[PDB]
Design a protein around this nucleic acid. Structure first.
Lengths: 184, 67, 144, 57
RNA sequence: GGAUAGUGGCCUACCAUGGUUUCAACGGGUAACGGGGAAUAAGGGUUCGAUUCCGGAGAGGGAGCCUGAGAAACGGCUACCACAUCCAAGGAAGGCAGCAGGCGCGCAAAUUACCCAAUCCUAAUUCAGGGAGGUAGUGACAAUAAAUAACGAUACAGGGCCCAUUCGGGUCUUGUAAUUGGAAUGAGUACAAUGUAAAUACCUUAACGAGGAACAAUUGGAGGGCAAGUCUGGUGCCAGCAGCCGCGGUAAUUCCAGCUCCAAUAGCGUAUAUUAAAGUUGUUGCAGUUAAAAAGCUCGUAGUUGAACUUUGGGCCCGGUUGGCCG
């Protein structure tokens, strides 16, 4: 009766499960980018492989092929928009030869870690999950957000956010009353 | 917050164009008391089981109860 | 050369020959013949419930020295007597007799696993409780 | 041969022991950070093969 | 010729002997409804598709039929056959393979909830009707994001580089070795505001929720493949482990208890079927001397395949296409 709701998987697991080189590479990437599980790296690898498959099925045809111009241009524009491709390298051979490090370097968690509002990527993801970031006019609770380069400038304390003012804080007044009780 | 907010020309037109659920949520009408669907369908089944008004049936029931 | 015909109109020969020689595959033959439906104790099923009958102290093949304390089980749907392994410790003491067991395959699509002859199934439950939770005492066998 | 008994002999006769008291260790993200800190930035034991869980000797 | 809304062996009478088939007829099986589809990711392929859409079919088994434009209709009848309440021993009424629910089968799944609010249909046509539909409960078959909290201080062991008066100091936290305090947050408080039918489901609240014996994370393993113990205690051909090789005749890195851990990590282990692995089904693309396999040898029909040769090549004229008389 009802029309089915289409779902899809976001990560494809590596076929060889246990190899020292790959295991250590993914572990180091996750730890130095402040990730908790391997689902992030698997999902981004799945997406990167999807993109590389698209690029291969694109470049297998000759230049000025009508479908080729459309799809290659759209893919290149999407990549520069998300920020993986640097501003002056639109060659599409590097689109084939992208890096999972290239994808994750732009990740919002690492962005706020570089901006240093948390002094540590652990505190950074803690902030993202605690919603003390108003990315634009709305607060985002995900470390993976593929920003649009205006939030970078717009990062501030939200009006309904602590550490920024206009609110003392329930815990702050609770501890003030506790200090008063300790004194008297 | 963004939602569907709309206006009418007048209150009478609003009442003539809005269903009773909207009317009762806006206080434009009174909440009429309806029975549960199972019971209403049970009586819709019962008056189909019996034919007509049933006055002759009540008379016959009294005649049999007099026995 | 190379045996098989190569002509542009030899498709029927190639197809028929492939059918004949595909009959030689073990799993293809079983799957098309339906040996899992006509000969398998489980009747093509992933699992089956059972009522244990008695205990068997069948020993282990060489080089080894132990017994593997299996149970004789009558099936419910098929009416077949099988010999099922109860893996964990004391599990014989927990399925002594007449208990309600749940049985599955053993991991070798119908072959004996280790040095235990004639056993191809193992239990995953007893009347609702799991054997390993029983082993770890997270739950207790229902006497009622 | 007539051995339908003595099941769980070792389960019976080993002493039942509980774990020593210790506060719960970090889990998940903190656990993987400790793994990173003891695996990548630790120069402690890189002697011949960079052991992972070296037994006491 | 009849019958049908119509053609027609659809059925009747007469006539001749034809029709299909090794290019597989006819028959048997189908744990067979078909298609659009799903799973592999080199290509080629393999397997299934009851099931959210379409085309069939059936309403317990066939059979018959009225009505109706449209049924061989089953929440319409007519019988037979097995299911199937009472008797006031005359007799009456049925098929939940529609929704909840019961029993059997069980390996295989959902509570006898609510309403036409959001989609259509039915009618004499706005309004009336709809377990069609929509809205809740259970539910880890499935897919997203992502909780089980993180801070900062040396509680001294040199990185950008130095004092250059041999660890005397490093202004930073690393290059931790068992003392660690907040400005703050989430599930749930839903008196209320968003929200539907009166409550719950995302966002907030004057007010509660963390200082962690609280709100505390499981599964498989440390011989190998496949990284993770000669770390301890127990047993010592016996309990077991062991998907496969293998472990133990009083010292087991494999059996039972813990710690450390290694992997995935609110996920994981296990059983069966299936796909790749499988170039172990080989069209692409396998092997046949000795590993499995060249029929004992030849003839031969269907099948498959089958030498070369028939207009070749020179001329002129242009729309227009890619570094290219030119920036």
């Amino acid at each position: 009766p009802r029309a089915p709701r289409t779902y899809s998987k976001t990560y494809s697991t590596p076929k060889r499960p246990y190899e020292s080189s790959r295991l250590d590479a993914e572990l180091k990437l996750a730890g130095e980018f402040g990730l908790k599980n391997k689902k992030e790296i698997y999902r981004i690898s799945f997406q990167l492989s999807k993109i590389r498959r698209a690029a291969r099925d694109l470049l297998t045809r000759d230049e000025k092929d009508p479908k080729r111009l459309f799809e290659g241009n759209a893919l290149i524009r999407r990549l520069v928009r998300v920020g993986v491709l640097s501003e002056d390298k639109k060659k599409l051979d590097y689109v084939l030869a992208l890096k999972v490090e290239d994808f994750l370097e732009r990740r919002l968690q690492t962005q706020v870690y570089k901006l240093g509002l948390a002094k540590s990527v652990h505190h950074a993801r803690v902030l993202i999950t605690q919603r003390h970031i108003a990315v634009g006019k709305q607060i985002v609770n995900i470390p993976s957000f593929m920003v649009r380069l205006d939030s970078e400038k717009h990062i501030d304390f939200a009006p309904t956010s602590p550490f920024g003012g206009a609110r003392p804080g329930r815990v702050a007044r609770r501890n003030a009353a506790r200090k008063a009780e300790a004194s008297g | 917050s963004v939602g569907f907010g709309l206006v009418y020309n007048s209150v009478a037109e609003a009442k003539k164009f809005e269903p009773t659920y909207r009317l009762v949520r806006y206080g434009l009408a009174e909440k009429v008391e309806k029975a549960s669907r199972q019971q209403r369908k049970q009586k819709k089944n019962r008056d189909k089981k019996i034919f007509g008004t049933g006055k002759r049936l009540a008379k016959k029931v009294a005649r049999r109860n007099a026995d | 050369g190379k045996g098989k015909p190569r002509g542009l109109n030899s498709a029927r020969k190639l197809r028929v020959h492939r059918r004949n020689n595909r009959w030689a595959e073990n799993n293809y033959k079983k799957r098309l013949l339906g040996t899992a439906f006509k000969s398998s104790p489980f009747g093509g099923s992933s699992h089956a419930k059972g009522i244990v009958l008695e205990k068997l102290g069948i020993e282990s093949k060489q080089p080894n020295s132990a017994i593997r304390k299996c149970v004789r089980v009558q099936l419910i749907k098929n009416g077949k007597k099988v010999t099922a392994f109860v893996p964990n410790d004391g599990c014989l003491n927990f399925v002594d007799e007449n208990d309600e067991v749940l049985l599955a395959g053993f991991g070798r699509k119908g072959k004996a696993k280790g040095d235990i002859p004639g056993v191809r199934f193992k239990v995953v439950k007893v009347s609702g409780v799991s054997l390993l939770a029983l082993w770890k005492e997270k739950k207790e066998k229902p006497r009622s | 041969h007539g051995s339908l008994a003595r099941a769980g002999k070792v389960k019976s006769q080993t002493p039942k022991v509980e774990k020593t008291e210790k506060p719960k260790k970090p889990k998940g993200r903190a656990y993987k950070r400790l793994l990173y800190t003891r695996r990548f930035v630790n120069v402690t034991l890189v002697n011949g093969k960079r052991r992972m869980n070296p037994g006491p000797s």
